[PDB]
Amino acid sequence: MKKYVCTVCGYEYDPAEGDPDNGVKPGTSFDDLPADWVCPVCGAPKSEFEAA
């Protein structure tokens, strides 16, 4: 349930919440996001998130 933060915009990916409108149900770990997922607030890539 390790949260990750976007280092562009500060958005926090929270595995307990997922990202439904991008097809990520609640409970999905950050490491299991789809290869094409990007930060939903700013568009940044997953390579620019850090553990939070």
The residue from 6, 15, 24, 30 that contacts Fe ion (CB under 5 A) is 6
Is 42 labelled a binding residue?
yes
- Contact between 33 and Fe ion by CB under 5 A: the answer reads no
Q: Are 32 and 46 in contact, with CB atoms under 8 Å apart?
A: no
Q: Are 15 and 3 in contact, with CB atoms under 8 Å apart?
A: yes
The residue from 19, 24, 30, 39 that contacts Fe ion (CB under 5 A) is 39
Task: Please give the residue ranges that form the binding site for Fe ion (CB under 5 A).
Answer: 6, 8-9, 11, 39, 41-42, 44
